[PDB]
Amino acid sequence: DDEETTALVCDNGSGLVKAGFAGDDAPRAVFPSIVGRPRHQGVMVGMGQKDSYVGDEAQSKRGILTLKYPIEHGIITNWDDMEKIWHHTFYNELRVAPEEHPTLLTEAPLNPKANREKMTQIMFETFNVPAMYVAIQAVLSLYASGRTTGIVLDSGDGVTHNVPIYEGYALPHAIMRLDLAGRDLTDYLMKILTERGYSFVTTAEREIVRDIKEKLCYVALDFENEMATAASSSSLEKSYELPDGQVITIGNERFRCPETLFQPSFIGMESAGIHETTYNSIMKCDIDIRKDLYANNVLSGGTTMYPGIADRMQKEITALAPSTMKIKIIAPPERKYSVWIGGSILASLSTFQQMWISKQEYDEAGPSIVHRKCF
Amino acid sequence: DDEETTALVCDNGSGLVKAGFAGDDAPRAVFPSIVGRPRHQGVMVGMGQKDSYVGDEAQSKRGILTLKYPIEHGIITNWDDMEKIWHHTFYNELRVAPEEHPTLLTEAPLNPKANREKMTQIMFETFNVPAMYVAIQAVLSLYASGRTTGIVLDSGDGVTHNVPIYEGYALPHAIMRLDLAGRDLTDYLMKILTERGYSFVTTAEREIVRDIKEKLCYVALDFENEMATAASSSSLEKSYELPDGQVITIGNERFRCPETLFQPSFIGMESAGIHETTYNSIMKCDIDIRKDLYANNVLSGGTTMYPGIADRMQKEITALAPSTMKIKIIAPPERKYSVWIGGSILASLSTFQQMWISKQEYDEAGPSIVHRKCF
Amino acid sequence: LMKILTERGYSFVTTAEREIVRDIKEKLCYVALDFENEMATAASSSSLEKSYELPDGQVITIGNERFRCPETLFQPSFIGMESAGIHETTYNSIMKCDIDIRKDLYANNVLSGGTTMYPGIADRMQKEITALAPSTMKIKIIAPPERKYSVWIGGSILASLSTFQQMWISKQEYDEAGPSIVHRKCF
Amino acid sequence: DDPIGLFVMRPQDGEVTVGGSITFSARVAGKPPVVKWFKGKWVDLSSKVGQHLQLHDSYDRASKVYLFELHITDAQPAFTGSYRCEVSTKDKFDCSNFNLTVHE
Amino acid sequence: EDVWEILRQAPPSEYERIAFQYGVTDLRGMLKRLKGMRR
Amino acid sequence: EDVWEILRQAPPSEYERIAFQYGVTDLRGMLKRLKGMRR
Amino acid sequence: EDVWEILRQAPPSEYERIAFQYGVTDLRGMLKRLKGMRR
């Protein structure tokens, strides 16, 4: 009931799937990437008691309904889950027919192709959108950065990569992921608080804890003197209302959760901090890109929204970088949407509709088409 | 408890350090050039849990113990590591006193001198061998070739050079390295398989992958028609037992790993394939050496043991060489040992003991002695 | 157990009532490897259908419970627990373990805990791992009968480990560092 | 009954009902041929092999027989349609399609 | 700034160069507002 | 077995390696009996 | 071959020329076996 169409700017933020339209300004879709299973079935008159309306209601059904990401590790283990996830989107919150609105498709690297293959065709059949398109979440924050040169540090919804760039020019060779997810930090948090006097395992228990991180948990630039600070610093020593109604007390954790992203010893991970992943990347970069980086040290990823994020970023680079060069990490507050924003852009980039995944193109070349000279 | 001595034919094969004696026939020493660090320290009664017995045991300790080459890039970043590496040798597998057995010393070009300076003195002090000597790994495969004329293509343990020669006569000007290491191929393999559906980063994970290459990964002469072959060729489409016990499936990689040595685009390297490094070298060679090369197109380097190695070698030279001339690349199966073999030879060359690095000579001239008129 | 037997015709809540019931488990309650065919078995299997003298003097009859008590350790649905069975806690652990530790596990699949003394304990242990493990690898869970004491035994050992008295918590050490001493570089 | 290629058993022409867990079976004396599940041409079925699209596949020495079988749980009209087991030895190939009509 | 006028008068696509020259990493945004205008 | 003689002649602490090599997860026990002897 | 006899009777060092003439790039090896003999 309008003009040609608006591309669908649908963005499965590694934790939440989100979305607006091309040229949109706010992803009108935002909500958990989980599926939920009650256990008991009190015989209950009548119905309306969905097994799997997780979408954005099921956390209302938290507890009895369990949790399921399909793309659990940024890895869609299952898809009908995610399928009806979409339908939920496009029919309750998108409440919109795919068939007539294009869409670009958010994706991080490292995917085996058939993931997209399948998602693609099924999105044409179940969806018959006018045409789709896919785009690396990473790249989609990249333009989303608009500093076409420099790396970006995508530690976002639950994701992590380094994205060296250079007026749009990025080196995949130097490009990397950090398996870390804010979910991961979640984990160690459960570890600590529970062992520290708490019994905190349950799905929405994880819900509360993630809330805890994203509201209060932080990091201090330093650690060891910042450890002594912790040794008696009462200010931190703050209890926060457990959403039961308890007031979950908090101290050194608030920060000792995230910081391990620089020291997976705490996660015990063999990996290395996100800073020196930046630095070894940059060293991989050409000789004097490095100053480009310095100006373009774009962080990305809201869960990383914590305090001092750059504070460290810079301090350690410093600790590693030649003071000769001047560093500057780059992280907008709005890093969640940034990826959505740049995707809006690109898809909304009217000089670019040639790229979208047409039903036909796929039809002649099936899904495999997607791969070469297209994604 | 015997006659004068046997020189020590000690050979840090770019990946493994190896060794026998002068006149020996098999390097009785062979094992990884890594150091290993556990993480956790489960409090564990008693001891015997070495930090750093890597040698040839620590891969038994793989996982918890990490990995460290000193000569990581054919570049000894550290030496006490390599120091006790030697001692391990000369005391567990050499289990032998340096002080009374000479030794020639394997080295690739491109080393800044002090590397050898230090190695030398310390090998006289810590080691007091009757006298040492050093010799370019490259040259040591060269005699090791015995075709004193012609280049050799040393892409070995993890190394890569072209070694134009000519009855012993080689032009360093025309001589070159290819940073490529079988480790490098390892890399791109991890890249691919992991992104292709795998999560393969860990040190011994790299162990398995290198095993994978050296057991199964190959190359097909051609690529593009050999690409179509890949497009459906089921025979390749073979899964190999992942040493967890998994059976890691394999297809186009087996070959799409190494071949990039001719196209670092895949490694993204600015460099050029190993064949045309041969060819531009040869063109640098005098007008009619080139046929010498053709007969003397000696490959070297076991990791290059793959299939078709020469197959391409010749085909592309062809593609470049005048059919006027008749080519013949030269690669024994036993290219690992070849370098050791020729070193055995030279050192074992009794008409040659004058060269060995005497304690005194170094004493009067310190290490700097080594350089002029000696190495 | 209290849940079931009581609702099943019994009024069994009292502290030492719990005493008797725990005795019941540790003397008679078991588990059968399988469940569903082992459920049909239960459907009429009279052999199980055995009453045991209630220590009042009653003889508390017993059937499917004997086993339907413990087995839920693999299915807290029965305890309703959100958790998962003890076997796949082993398995997800092992998968967390390095690539080829897993065979180490297989040989080292050491159970511990006497209350778990029941029958088939490993029987399942292995069967389900199997059901999950690659037959490539060969499994072996490890549980001595004497698992209660085992912990005591190894503690005897360590403490008795005379090459180790350096670790013990000295009055003084605590005195200078109070209790907090305990924590770092000691426990 | 129907003609046999390999298909000593043939994945049937399923006129199932909704919910009819139906086993399309090539129990065939069996290199043993690889099976190729197809609805559509660009379109695989393995990406859809799930609890409702399930397989038992195993050889016999006694009879030289191998079982491809496909139990279909929770039969749905969405999966009403054409399906294929294109099977090939190291030398041969076998192409003949079969039906899933999940009725109701 | 003049980035407004200079991008409106920028060469059609090289708003790239002009926006990202004058700090506008959101040439992305410059066009996306220009698109909310020209959608 | 010889584990007896080989542990008595095992390197002093690496009775660890020898006991646990010859199946003696009770090097624990090997020493604890050796300790009931040497307590 | 006669490379054996001709190298044994080759001029002392120019076993170089004779070995590498008769294909023996392992004059290296010719001497190394002669050395396992003369070590």
Chain F residues with at least one Cβ partner in B under 8 Å = 13-14, 16-17
B41 to chain G, any CB pair closer than 8 A? The answer is no
List the single residue in B22, B342, B351 with the smallest CB-CB distance to G28. B342
What's the number of CA atoms in the CB half-sphere (13 Å) around residue B40? 9
Nearest CA in chain C to B245: C136
Which of F15, F16, F30, F32 is the best residue to mutate to test the B interface, defined by the most B CB atoms within 10 Å of its own CB? Answer: F16
Task: Estimate to the nearest angstrom the gap between the alpha carbon of B127 and the chain centroid.
Answer: 25
Q: 């079976």: which residue's tokens?
A: D25
Helices (H), chain B: 54-57, 80-88, 113-125, 137-145, 182-195, 203-215, 225-232, 253-256, 274-284, 289-295, 309-320, 335-348, 359-364
Neighbours of A142 (CB within 10 A): 28
Give the residue numbers of the binding site of D: 54, 56, 69, 71
The answer to whether the Cβ–Cβ distance between A173 and B268 falls below 8 Å is yes
The answer to whether the Cβ–Cβ distance between E19 and A146 falls below 8 Å is yes
Q: Sign of the CA dihedral B78, B81, B87, B89?
A: negative
Which of C91, C98, C132 is the best residue to mutate to test the B interface, defined by the most B CB atoms within 10 Å of its own CB? Answer: C98
- Nearest-CA distance from B339 to chain G in Å? 11
Touch of B by C (3+ CB pairs closer than 8 Å): yes
B268 CB neighbours in chain A (<8 A) are: 171-173
Rounded Cα distance, D69 and D53, in Å? 10
The answer to whether the Cβ–Cβ distance between A144 and E19 falls below 8 Å is no
Rounded Cα distance, G22 and G15, in Å? 10
Give the residue numbers of the binding site of D for Zn(2+): 54, 56, 69, 71
Q: What is the maximal distance between C-alpha atoms in chain D?
A: 41
Rounded Cα distance, B252 and B241, in Å? 17
Is-contact A285 A171, C-beta < 8 A?
A: yes
- Nearest-CA distance from A176 to chain C in Å? 22
Nearest CA in chain D to A365: D42
Is-contact D35 D26, C-beta < 8 A?
A: yes
- The CA-based angle B105-B107-B112, given to 5 degrees, is 115
Give the pair of three-digit tokens for residue C57: 């003097």
A366 to chain D, any CB pair closer than 8 A? The answer is yes
The answer to whether the Cβ–Cβ distance between C157 and F38 falls below 8 Å is no
The answer to whether the Cβ–Cβ distance between C82 and A201 falls below 8 Å is yes
A350 to chain E, any CB pair closer than 8 A? The answer is yes
Q: Sign of the CA dihedral D10, D11, D15, D20?
A: positive
Rounded Cα distance, A211 and A35, in Å? 18
Which of A166, A270, A277 is the best residue to mutate to test the B interface, defined by the most B CB atoms within 10 Å of its own CB? Answer: A270
Q: 């506008």: which residue's tokens?
A: E24
Give the pair of three-digit tokens for residue B108: 């690739």
Q: Rounded to the nearest 5°, which phi and psi values hold at C156? A: -45, -60
Touch of F by B (3+ CB pairs closer than 8 Å): yes
The answer to whether the Cβ–Cβ distance between C77 and A202 falls below 8 Å is no
- Nearest-CA distance from G36 to chain B in Å? 6
Rounded Cα distance, C28 and C118, in Å? 9
* Closest-CA residue to F28 (of C97, C104, C110, C91): C110
First to last CA, chain C: 38
Nearest CA in chain B to A170: B268
A51 to chain D, any CB pair closer than 8 A? The answer is no
Nearest CA in chain A to E37: A23
Rounded Cα distance, A160 and A154, in Å? 5
Rounded Cα distance, A340 and A11, in Å? 6
Single-letter residue type at D33: P
Q: How was this structure determined?
A: cryo-EM
Neighbours of chain F (3+ CB pairs under 8 A): B, C
Residues in contact with E26: Cβ distance below 8 Å, sequence separation at least 6, in sequence order: A146, E19, E32
Residues in contact with A2: Cβ distance below 8 Å, sequence separation at least 6, in sequence order: none
Rounded Cα distance, B308 and F16, in Å? 50
Rounded Cα distance, A140 and A347, in Å? 10
Q: Rounded to the nearest 5°, which phi and psi values hold at B273? A: -50, 160
B147 CB neighbours in chain G (<8 A) are: 20, 25
Neighbours of chain A (3+ CB pairs under 8 A): B, C, D, E
Rounded Cα distance, A271 and A261, in Å? 9
Could you say which residues from 117 to 156 on chain A have a Cβ atom under 8 Å away from some Cβ of chain E? Answer: 143-148
**Is beta strand B297-300 parallel, antiparallel or unpaired with respect to B329-330?**
parallel
Nearest CA in chain F to C164: F13
Exposure b/e, A151-182, CB count within 10 A at least 16 = b: bbbbbbbbbbbbbbbbeeebbebbbbbbbbbb
The answer to whether the Cβ–Cβ distance between B342 and G27 falls below 8 Å is no
Rounded Cα distance, C9 and C32, in Å? 24
Residues in contact with B374: Cβ distance below 8 Å, sequence separation at least 6, in sequence order: B355, B357, B361
Touch of F by A (3+ CB pairs closer than 8 Å): no
A353 to chain E, any CB pair closer than 8 A? The answer is no
Catalogue the E-assigned strands of chain C. Answer: 50-52, 60-62, 109-110, 141-142
DSSP states of A193-247? HHHTT----SHHHHHHHHHHHHHT----S-SSHHHHHHHH-TTT-EEE--TTS--
Rounded Cα distance, A317 and A313, in Å? 6
Rounded Cα distance, D78 and B17, in Å? 62
DSSP states of B237-263? -EEE--TTS--EEESTHHHHTGGGGG-
Resolution number, Å: 8.0
The answer to whether the Cβ–Cβ distance between C163 and F13 falls below 8 Å is yes
Rounded Cα distance, B287 and A124, in Å? 63
The answer to whether the Cβ–Cβ distance between F31 and C153 falls below 8 Å is no
G16 CB neighbours in chain B (<8 A) are: 148
Give the pair of three-digit tokens for residue E16: 């790239």
